[model samples]
Target: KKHFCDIRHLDDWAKSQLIEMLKQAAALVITVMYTDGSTQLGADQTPVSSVRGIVVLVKRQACGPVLEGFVSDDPCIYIQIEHSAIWDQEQEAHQQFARNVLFQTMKCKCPVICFNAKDFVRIVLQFFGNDGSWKHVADFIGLDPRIAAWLIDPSDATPSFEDLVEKYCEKSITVKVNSTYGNSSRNIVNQNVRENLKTLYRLTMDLCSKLKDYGLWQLFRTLELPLIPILAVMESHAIQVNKEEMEKTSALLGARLKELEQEAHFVAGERFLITSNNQLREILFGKLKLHLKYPSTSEAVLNALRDLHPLPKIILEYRQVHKIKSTFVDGLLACMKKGSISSTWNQTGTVTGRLSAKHPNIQGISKHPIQITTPKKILTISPRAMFVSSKGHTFLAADFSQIELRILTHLSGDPELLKLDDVFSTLTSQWKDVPVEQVTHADREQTKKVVYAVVYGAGKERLAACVPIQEAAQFLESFLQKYKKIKDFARAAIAQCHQTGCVVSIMGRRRPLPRIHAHDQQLRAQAERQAVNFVVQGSAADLCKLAMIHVFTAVAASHTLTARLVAQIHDELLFEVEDPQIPECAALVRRTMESLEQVQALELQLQVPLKVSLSAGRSWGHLVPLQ
Candidate 1:
């Protein structure tokens, strides 16, 4: 039954009864309330959105609004919490008691379930974080029905609460669905909260069954579940940044952008918005009268007209510098708190089963430092340089080398592609008739681009944008002809999708390709590209996530290893390791990453060895080879 009342409305008698019922709960289903009715917090960590109220479902009854006991047959206490500016002692004391009891209840050995439970874990950890026992609890993440539904068919991105109900429970909560959400009336808020808990409880049961029947329970248990608290904790800890250096960089970038704006105006013979594609399009083709086979403001079109006129080249450089400055400097400066910032890692942002981060995208920052040259001097602004480890701690980046190609080799079993370990060095030696040591950077880069053009499905036109299209196309053809099995692998992916309507990753992750059977040629072709790409990309994501869980567990259990996972980029995991423990930790990271035991546990019979190179730096931007 539902008892809707303020925590203050509940007398000591009612509070005691609720606590007793909570202790005997078969399971605790929890969801949090924040100021502004926000469910998830922004990565910038504004302090105002601190947890205003908490909704916990037990066998017995609290919402502040409509406190006249909106009791239900399925008993739960829904407390409507309003965080007002002026608070008296009683309200504060009431919240304190509820918070402590709820925190205590988490230790009662009952499964805590929630949709997007990372927020719940974070809230609890922030409250009871200093306690050593709580961290041990954090090590155990629970069943998130949202992620569970996704694993059953990962093709669908993160679904909303209503979407989850529609997909799984199928109109079971029609009465609950009628209530409006978001800063609505107290009657509406309480009504919504009551139904939300009930709906979530049903969703979890339904999703749990789908996980098993779809053969996704193992993956859910091993990879996604434990990762929730790990990600939440990672989001909790801010990576240190050099505030003075960041301000300097931001000012320099802002000035450089203005200078570029002036240069573009002077070159175009008139002032115009340098960043606008439409204006640039009119200026380039409309005013400058540059000739090309096709007309657009794209990088390819600009590169084609680069030799025909100097304006295209100037604008291209302007575009590059502006993006680096805006994305890296100005955008990042807004997020700085104290000296550093933390980012939110999204587990279900991609259809390929890969992870994504936002606010300040950790993966988007260039590993190689950006260089800007002006009339007087040269400026080097590295976004990552500001991101530093704590004192006496060094940044450790474990990089998996060409993992996509390595994975493609296993998928295709192509001997030529399998030589990926030596593909660069061997080619560099052959092309220049020099040893691996003498191989030039340009040669390796050129070869690397062409090599990946095949695997990544990049056409010749997208490769260089100029006269080399024929040679690039010819090279791609030759490479495909030579590595026939690699081509065969692509064909097999499309063929499998056509037959079964889905493609499965090595770790058993599946993406349904409904568009594979589309009658339209373009749709079918695009779907083919997606299908083949997902096979390799999804599997790689699975491997990286597994490594994160594995290493986090190792660090958690160890007395000597004191490393903290900072972030996970595409094929790399960034960690802050204590200086003295670096050697043991580095060896451990490499061992677990390259270890056959964890790899085989994923249920993929991989024939190729995983190679992860370790690097260390005081700042994230400058990681050097770890010895």
Candidate 2:
């Protein structure tokens, strides 16, 4: 009877609403059965018994269906509904039932389950009569090797169900359908649908064994599983964009680009395609003789020659405006779906377990404001402003301040860096005549570059490029003398990487280092830098993801559809909140992000505090600190 739960008799509205409710509940397994055995498309429009089964953790009193006649409110663990009696093909009744179930499931705080990762199931189902497949239902779940391997025979692109029925159920199926149907072979394939389900059950159990072996079961259960529906909802909840403003920005950029081209041509003494790298190389190195051994027009080569020539500066300016015009303005408009833009989040995309976004990469957009100056005037723009919230809604953005540096301090346990206030003041007192109580922006930037240099294993020559080459060696020596622990930490990271041929993050995510033992000095040194970098950067990424999951859960559980998580740009999360609830949501997000230091997942309290800076704006570009 449980196996026969079908949804075909339910009207389209009821079917959609039921699926949405089930998705929000995030149940372990949900089976939908239709008596007519129609596909998801329902091309024939045939109707029969409709049933849905929801698996819950606890068995309550007879509050629901599947076993016998019961009301919808019964506190049963497993609820099975036979919808054929109540089912109306009429749209209004269908919509009413769907609406009732939506609120019913919401009140229960039941997690929504998605079959996004079960591609093999759909593939096998294609062999049977029903066209119902994974393509219609796949959401947040991704394929794990243990289950995927059994779903398809790796030797050939064959469903394991074919071999399964041939080996075990061939005789029983052959006898039952021998004379029942003229096409006996078709009957056997149909029998495999139930047989395939049995195979899937075994595969699921076996998959759990491998998950435990890899120590991935807990992670899969707690973080990855629940986060799927949250992400699905977030992806569906669109963010508003200002198409007209972007068009204006693009046109302004085009005019500015033309001006830059003319300036570049004037400097070059002839009109050549400023966009052409070869022509720019000839103009810079051959004609202008800017003191370069190789004729290169790369960004680095141009950067080193910025002060040497007006042409390089013009070219740099031209490229900046051109990039903004091409990537953000034109690129984003083309990718918009409906009224908003949706970026795909790949949970397993990055080697470091960091989530990656594609299709008009909101992640890659620069956080820095754009400043362009022509001979006539100077203009400044914030690209974030291009993205606007809907009417009566404001954008709330929160970011972990210097999270990576704080992570480094926690990992290294460097007392000097831990007490940042004292270190900043001490460093600032030497540079300025006035007594300094806090660090200036310049001082912080200087320290940040030096810290990055040391962590990445940059030499004196490298440090000199960031700071002054004259003081680079002495600066590193004196700085390391004050914070010897940090240097020791970096050395230990590289040494361990060499020993194990890999590096591991604080959260135990491993990154293999195949180039650690490279014969080439440059390649080996690069690997050495990556060894330490991965620990700090990868851990920060893990922390951000955990924070995102928590923040999303808190918002969703509250059922505040008005307050939505919209964009994640690096360390910052942007939410579009109804104007009336902005403060409440802002407070909640800030509390969640800052309190991540106490999160139990990491199993270690951060040595240094995690701090968050939150701000609010009507548009993405106009954020001001929240009072």
Candidate 3:
């Protein structure tokens, strides 16, 4: 509810009210329409492509008076403006100038626009020749003259048109699809439409193929990466939660459970299951005898009855099983569902209470591509496995290994750290002096937990709960000793963020840190941790976005390459390629992945680097080795 604002979606009442308000304002109406939930505004029909073209007309035309009609029903908001005779074609230079201005507008932050026919005509004509030249048009709307000049004389400018707009105009705007007011359909890949796929393929290829060129490659390398797709491996490898160990844990827990159960009886005057039981006396003797203990705790009573016998349980058992059938049965089911024991059984129709990467049911969960309804599901970074669709599309999921740490290492330009694949790997392998054909995966897992827990400002209490407290403490001390520079680097970055309110990636992407400079120790501590990691995560995200643009372009340009990008999860990519082109595709993908490590003035070690461990599996489990 906090995120929801009704004012934004009052379609019938607000639409009419806004329209009437516009009429009352003597809105020098550039356009008007009664659209049937779907009409396009831009010269191009495609919603994805239209955003680029629409911003041009919006910049040059007077349409703030028109009161843009948008509704929730249409996945895209479109406008069909009445064509105007505003452009003076006779003035060739002006026409070229207008075209350049339009180009500049297209690249600005949040470019989606819906131009009416009249609106497009007026703006386009003004570009070539201002018959009714839109000088008032420029002032009527908040049109930046820089945009106007850029349109007249477009350039392949360093820092680009986008950079200029960001520096001058957009202060705190984040133009993201998730944050916008459009139907989910707009973002989905429509399998039913042939032309849509054709256009998308063309666009992606055009963008990615340019990465191979020297000029574009340099530009691409410098852009800050985005963080939308980082995946976390879900399969727990450290501590290796084995069944035998769990059985011991569950048994040890029984005494604690018994003690709690005895307390419940002392309170309720009868016995009950401690893990699931309710302290009925807390309500009965202490306060108003409302109905009964919550149904959930009552169910806890039934659970205890099922396990133990005799007069100790007789009164309670009879009261629960017979006297209160409705309450007891209902409560029992509710209590059972609370524990992981029941959740596993409910989902898969079995009660082994043991999870394996090898299970088909779990593997099956990964093969499915993201669906529109499941927004939270998309956020998972399960590097443990990948999924494949029935359509022969393979979904490869992987988080770039210690991407933030790697970036820090690289940015620091510390050759001492860069020589190792990952900092944790280097530290945990006993400095590589021990004889070894291979290092156990377990060590890597332990190092990963310790590194992340420490890097993100986790303290000893939480670390102790996760591993042997001493081991965790020792690892933290060793980690700090080995990478003291990184610790200092984090502190400095946080300080910069505090002073400036945000940090910029090497490619100039900005990441804003919420203010955490309070005197309060707890709040400041949280802010400090986020401040250190935000630069790493945010910058890495920017890098990935650039990589996507590059790789998409490459596939489009190369008809000979058999593999196509099926899905991308953070740093790893899943390719659906013909068997013959596997090696070729791998080479190309790898090339783009590593092309952007050195984009800024200061080379910081632990900034970013690519090190991959891959598997070929029919299911996600095989690819990620969740076991």
- lDDT string, candidate 2, 165-194, tens digits: 343342433212121123334335234333
Model 1 agreement with the true structure over 1-627: per-residue lDDT tens digits = 235544456677767756665666667767776654444311122324656666766533212222223333445554445556787897678667766665655565566677778767776667655544335655555668878877876767567776777778855563243332444655775566766777787788889888888777777877788889888878877898888788888777677678878888898898888888889888888877786333888888889887887788888887888877778877887787777788888887787777889878887887567688754355687777888899999998898887888888889999876665346777667656777887777778766766666665667787655237777687678678878888899999989999989988877788888999999998998899889998998888888888787777777777777788888888888889998878888988888777743455546667788888899989887888855
Q: How many steric overlaps are in each model, in order?
A: 15, 19, 62
Instruction: Give Cα-based local distance difference scores for all models.
Output: 0.73, 0.60, 0.38
TM-score of each: 0.82, 0.66, 0.45
By lDDT, the best candidate is 1
* lDDT: worst 10-residue window of model 2: 38-47
> Model 3 over residues 1-627: C-alpha lDDT tens digits?
211112224355654553333333311211111122112321122333222122111221212433334422112211222233664553344334335433333233431222222233333433324333222222122212222222122221212222333333323322111211244343221211212212222322333343333133332223311111111011100111123333433333333334445554564555544323234433332342333333333545445544332322433533432322222222222323212111111101111111112221222233322211111123322212222322343323323567666766755454556656435655567745454436666676766676677766777778777567777677677767767777777778778878876555544434444556677888777777766766666556555655554554455457587454444444655555555555566666666555545434334233445654343444343554221
Better structure of 1 and 2 per lDDT:
1
Candidate 1 local Cα displacement, residue 393, angstroms: 1.5
Q: What is the lDDT of residue 295 in candidate 1?
A: 82
**Could you say which candidate leads in TM-score?**
1
Sorted on lDDT, best first, the list reads 1, 2, 3
Question: Candidate 2 regions off by >4 Å?
Answer: 1-6, 9-208, 258-320, 374-377, 421-443, 517-521, 559-562
